[PDB]
Nucleic acid binder design. Structure first.
Lengths: 633, 636
DNA sequence: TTTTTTTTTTTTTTTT
């Protein structure tokens, strides 16, 4: 049933309305129900309501519920969709109007960056992070309804003057070859609808009432497109929280909720404050943490659930200790409270802080998911290495051999492989094993049986040795095929091969520490050290492990916001730019994602650059309500 | 020679006769010949024969043939036309005998639907497919010479009695603003003709001999018009094939071939049965499939052409693998056989199934053409330009004024229009014309009146001018409002503008040569040039597009291809559920019959093994049709 | 340091 605010937002259907749903307030229920009502209580034909969101997920999720309350029929034609779906669908539908049609495949992300590489070879470094900016910064001036020259105007800085020119060639090639990146799909009808009234109204009448979720994420283009979509008839309901604006660095106009209030003054801010997920204690902290932010709309959250357990603040000594402690504490909790691996979540600022957890987690046969990113254990360089090791440990895994055969770079053609397989198959065994039967010698010969022997040899003599000197063996397995060189030849920019390699050491060193065992951890047979690694290789129980950003709009019973140091959470970059407000929002989000218990963690020391630094507790931990926080020792 | 059937068709010129030209028969030949012959061998005077058709195409087609076996003398001075052109002309012509102003407005269907939309808002669901039924169903109580009232009687069902009402509303607005949708073009003369004798005869004496093609498509009014026209001599020759009656849902009485057989004593069916296009296997198949359908008229196709390859029936797994195999096999066949994508045709029951084929063909650099895509006479840039012309030649066309006043963009606000209308209303006359009553000056003034007057004046001046230099007037009409620029502002990308523009030019040009007059057809006054465009006699016409012929089953209707790919051969789709769960499929049967008969060399069926229907899925069973077909020549 | 974005099917055909 509807809690008052919800109720109110649901009923106010007569004008430009803004619902300021605090976290866990249940917006999607409102929206749905708004729709459902709009239909059943004010006639307002289904086909005349547009529900816009940002992700193709929210999208299906919303469609799910809608149809779950609305009867198959009446629910007919709901303009539920992403911005981009529509934005495109406009371009599409009105192009068919002039009688004509369109045909220029959206330049899906990659394609762009790609095109951007060839576009900026000598101009700009062969680097990902770089190109990223280039991409992003380009996609910005675009959301700043600008031209590749108007942008050289508003262009202060060396590589920026460059990005501008580069930018120039981007739209250059695109306008030309006849294709469009994503944001184009918005600033497309946006323009096409402003410049022309004929079309404008047709939409204005298609889209009788519009609802928009996740409004704090809105960018200019969308913003306008929205305005255009319902200019002053203004029969809508935008929905958001300004304290959850975090993708500002990506065209999200923070003051969107305010800007709205201006070019729309009969705005009725209805706010949802009741929370259905977090304990009182969590909410209190969050509630306070965020009040240190210069605040406009007052929003003070509250739930009807029990005050929880104290927010603990585990202080780790170094980068590793942290992961160790968490994974450790993750496990205990879990054991003692008989819960599920998925009730847990581990959140960080940057993507690297993940690497080390990925270790312990895996090292402790604790299943997980690297939502925010890509699990170390997939990265080909490591998948490959794994397989050799899998082979070594188990010469019956055709899977692995089939994969490592020539991949490190020998000359064992598919023939010399399918024929060994074919003879191995009827002699009933593994390839590597059968790659030794003297009867296989004449089913296949030539130069293929001249590389297969050699290789399958090199392996076995190493596999032999690993039997007592794993490390050595592996170490030898490494420099042996000179994966290093191989990578440098296969990997794109060397820096990638460099990293692709760095990974390879990492793995090995892990694998080593494990074989070496330790003071309390009795050492492992290479076979186990392997199986540990291997297990890695959705209706699954596993620890959500992702970045705060990754976490936006999710929840989990137990959260470990790790790395609560200054440089890190209050991200140094931002630290020194005086914008923290966002970082703060960032934290506050993090925090409001946990529902039963929350734990913060920080490293007492970080390795600056071989130079070790003793960082200070994310000021955030301090602004929190100390009565409910429990710093360790 | 000419095959006997054909011949006898041609020699029989003494009474009520029907030629049952089966698929491939030679239909166009015979007609041309019969007219040529009527004249030459029978003494009939070129100016007394009328050959009616359904489309402005066949008509041009026919006029070409005929015209080239005779000369402009007997030729260009003969009555070949569509029904509507005739129906209209009857209206016009006898309005003149009555000396009245024919200033009504032809409501091109689009114009029609829209009017409905408005007139049908809260009443009915803002939906295409909906409006359609509304339109159609409306165009039929009409085609059944029925009132918006007697129709409520002949109304069973809710959204139906609704329609009747809406209809009431439709006919209501029409009759009032003085405009007529196409159906009125036939229903008017007909009535006009049966209610009065003086006229009747007059026409009975003008059209001394009439021939009507594609008779199986005749609807009531149509037919009734015929009857009237032909009166008692019966000197005529309708031609057709009830086995090809597929637009039954749009007013076509299938039983026409029969109905005819009755109101007419000595009907002498003559039946052409020799195909000359499809292989004996195709014909085989087709001739058989059709037999499952009931029959009052007995025939059987059969060509001399060699018996051909086996009718293959590719079973695909999903919505997409279907298009995948087709485009694939298409490519293959062409490669090793080498035979322009034009030789190739893919035909579906509905248009969605186009959406997936368009992919793979384009995904494979295969050029192709897409069945039916918004007549040129519907591009906004055109309907706009038309409107002006409409208004220029007929100042009594509010609809047209109403669409133009501000469109090319002056500053004539809806108020300023609201008030023109009111004044124009009370004084009972045009907005345009009212625009000048000195009395309007007081109901409205300020800036609108300034804009209003400026405009309507300019227009007047053009109007005045066109009197003498049609093109120069139109020429200045265009440049005058800067339509070009307009497009460049209104149109999305610039290229579309240029295109939209190009379209404008073209129209200009046709209009021109139409005015400038042909040496086969006598020159036209601009008012006529208009009525033509109004009928969308776009006059189509060497270097045709050698790409894929992709179209609906309906878009096949008389058209031939060497190799066809009759896709989506499942139950639901092909024999459409609408029909399935209706009791009549005979229609869908014909539908297929046709689709089949359309390929001449080799046919190939195809069925999706799984649906993309219901958001989920379904394991569909082959178009029963597929199984009624000769198993011997069929493959899997 | 952080990272979404989708050309189908709307589910029957269309002169004049």
């Amino acid at each position: 049933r509807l809690n008052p605010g919800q109720q109110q937002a649901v009923e106010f259907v007569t004008g430009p309305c803004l619902v300021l749903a605090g976290a866990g307030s249940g917006k999607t229920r409102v929206i749905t129900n708004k729709i459902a009502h709009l239909i059943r209580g004010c006639g307002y034909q289904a086909r005349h309501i547009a529900a816009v969101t940002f992700t193709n997920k929210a999208a299906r999720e919303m469609k799910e519920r809608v149809g779950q309350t609305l009867g198959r029929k009446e629910a007919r034609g709901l303009m539920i969709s992403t911005f981009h779906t529509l934005g495109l669908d406009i371009i599409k539908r009105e192009y068919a109007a002039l009688g004509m049609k369109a045909n220029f495949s959206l330049f899906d992300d990659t394609d762009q960056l790609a095109l951007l590489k060839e576009l900026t070879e000598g101009l700009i470094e062969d680097d990902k992070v770089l190109l990223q900016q280039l991409i992003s910064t380009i996609s910005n001036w675009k959301n700043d309804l600008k031209t590749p020259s108007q942008a050289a105007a508003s262009a202060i800085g060396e590589r920026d003057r460059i990005f501008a020119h580069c930018y120039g060639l981007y739209d250059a090639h695109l306008k030309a070859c006849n294709v469009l990146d994503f944001d184009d799909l918005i600033l497309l009808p946006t323009l096409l609808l402003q410049a022309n009234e004929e079309v404008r109204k047709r939409w204005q009448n298609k889209i009788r009432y519009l609802l928009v979720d996740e409004y704090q994420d809105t960018n200019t283009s969308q913003y306008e497109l929205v305005k255009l979509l319902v200019g002053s008839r203004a029969r809508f309901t935008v929905v958001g929280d300004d304290d959850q604006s975090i993708y500002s660095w990506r065209g999200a106009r923070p003051q969107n909720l305010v800007l709205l209030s201006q070019d729309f003054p009969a705005l009725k801010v209805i706010k949802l404050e009741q929370n259905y997920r977090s304990s009182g204690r969590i909410l209190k902290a969050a509630n306070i943490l965020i009040a240190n932010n210069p605040h406009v709309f007052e929003k003070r959250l509250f739930s009807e659930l029990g005050y929880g357990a104290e927010l603990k603040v585990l202080s780790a000594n170094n980068e590793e200790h942290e992961a160790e402690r968490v994974t450790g504490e993750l496990i205990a909790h879990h054991f003692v409270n008989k819960t599920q691996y998925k009730d847990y979540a581990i959140l960080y600022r940057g993507n690297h802080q993940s690497r080390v957890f990925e270790k312990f987690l895996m090292q402790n046969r604790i299943p997980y998911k690297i939502s925010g990113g890509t699990s170390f254990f997939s990265r080909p360089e490591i998948k490959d290495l794994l397989a050799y090791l899998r082979v070594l440990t188990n010469p019956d895994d055709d899977s692995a051999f089939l994969r490592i055969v020539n991949t490190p770079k020998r000359e064992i053609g598919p023939a010399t492989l399918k024929k060994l397989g074919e003879w191995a198959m009827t002699r009933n065994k593994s390839m590597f094993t059968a790659s030794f039967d003297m009867g296989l010698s004449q089913t296949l010969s030539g130069r293929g049986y001249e590389a297969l022997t050699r290789f399958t040899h090199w392996l076995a003599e190493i596999q032999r040795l690993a039997e007592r000197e794993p490390i050595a063996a592996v170490r030898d397995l490494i420099h042996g095929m000179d994966y290093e060189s191989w990578l440098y030849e296969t990997s794109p920019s060397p820096k990638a091969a460099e990293m692709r390699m760095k990974n390879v050491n990492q793995l090995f060193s892990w694998m080593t520490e494990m074989l070496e065992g330790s003071e309390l951890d009795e050492p492992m047979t290479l076979t186990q050290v392997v199986t540990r690694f291997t297990l890695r290789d959705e209706e699954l129980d596993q620890v959500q492990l992702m970045t705060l950003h990754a976490s936006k709009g999710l929840e989990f019973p137990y959260v470990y916001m790790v790395g609560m140091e200054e440089g890190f959470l209050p991200h140094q970059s931002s630290i020194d730019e005086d914008n923290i407000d966002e970082e703060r929002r960032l934290a506050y989000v993090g925090i409001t994602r946990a529902q039963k218990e929350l734990t913060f963690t920080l490293c007492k020391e970080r390795r600056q650059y071989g130079e070790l630094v003793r960082p200070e507790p994310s000021r955030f931990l301090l602004e929190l309500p100390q009565d409910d926080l429990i710093w360790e020792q």
